[PDB]
């Protein structure tokens, strides 16, 4: 976190499971997308039940996926025209040219 009143950073939470990162991207400031060297995808969701202080500094891995491809990049923006369904869009860069 970054508290503008204090001026300094603040550790809300931290995941502990040791995965070698490859690229990460924020979805919606609640769900956080992460890649891996092991050619995989997962999202850590910020924990809701703030019953104590130990259980609110621990993120929770919510959802797993094997994207069978290395991940380099993430970015926003879509490829279709704006006609003004689903919400948001994240494109990702790879090593085999598979967007």
């Amino acid at each position: 976190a970054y508290k503008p009143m204090e001026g300094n950073f603040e550790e809300i939470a931290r995941d502990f499971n040791p995965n070698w990162m490859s690229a990460v991207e924020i979805l919606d400031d609640d769900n956080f997308l992460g890649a891996e060297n092991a050619f995989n995808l997962f999202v850590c969701q910020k924990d809701s039940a703030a019953t104590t202080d130990e259980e609110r500094q621990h993120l929770q891995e919510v959802g797993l996926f094997h994207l069978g491809e290395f991940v380099n990049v993430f970015c926003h923006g879509s490829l279709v025209m704006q006609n003004l369904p689903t919400q948001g869009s994240v494109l990702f860069g790879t090593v085999n040219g598979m967007i």
Partner: protein
């Protein structure tokens, strides 16, 4: 040895108080203009202490440090209490509601301000902390004159300020508004021809929690 004074003796005045309070076992007396000595016997003793040019980094007692003046002689006498003076903390705090009944604790815990080392405020009788949240939001003006720096020993502990890193922040919102008032009071009393002892003893309380985290927001 044979350390007597050239003025009127202070220990004989102390022992004259040690023959009145030490024999007070349920006798039905109120020593509130007599125990004024216990807050006045040390202030004249402080008034002569400024001659020796003291080092302010004196967390210990002069009975261990400076046997040259009468400060180290007299603080050792009232500190070797042998579970006799030590029941006064259980007495004038736990069952204390009245202002002459709270006179006999707040004018006296400030007399053992170097003596209050670690574990009296750290004891499981810790409602005195929540009593001082009650004795600052709702107290009397001669009481709040002698009530702000009483948790000064609590903020010296890093364990009380971590157990109460948001309960104290409630109280900081009170004491800064009063702290703003004294610049509006005393300067306007001095802006006439063109009181600060609470201002001394509130900053004594507010100093050791001036360093801690997450308190700078309501500071600025």
């Amino acid at each position: 040895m044979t350390t007597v004074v050239v003025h009127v003796d202070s220990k004989a005045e102390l022992t004259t108080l040690l023959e009145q309070w030490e024999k007070e076992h349920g006798s039905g007396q109120d020593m509130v203009p007599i125990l004024t000595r216990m807050s006045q016997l040390i202030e004249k003793e402080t008034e002569e202490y400024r001659k020796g040019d003291p080092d302010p980094f004196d967390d210990r007692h002069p009975g261990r440090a400076d046997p040259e003046c009468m400060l180290g002689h007299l603080l050792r006498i009232l500190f070797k209490n042998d579970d006799f003076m030590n029941a006064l903390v259980n007495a004038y705090v736990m069952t204390s509601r009245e202002p002459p009944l709270n006179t006999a604790a707040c004018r006296l815990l400030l007399d053992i301000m170097p003596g209050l080392e670690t574990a009296v405020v750290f004891q499981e009788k810790e409602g005195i902390v929540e009593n001082l949240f009650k004795w600052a939001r709702e107290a009397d003006q001669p009481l709040r004159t002698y009530s702000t720096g009483l948790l000064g020993g609590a903020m010296e502990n890093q364990d009380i300020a971590a157990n109460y890193r948001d309960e104290n922040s409630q109280l900081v919102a009170i004491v800064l508004r009063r702290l703003r008032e004294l610049q509006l009071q005393e300067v306007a009393l001095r802006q006439e021809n063109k009181p600060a002892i609470e201002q001394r003893l509130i900053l004594q309380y507010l100093t050791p929690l001036g360093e801690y985290q997450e308190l700078l927001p309501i500071f600025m």
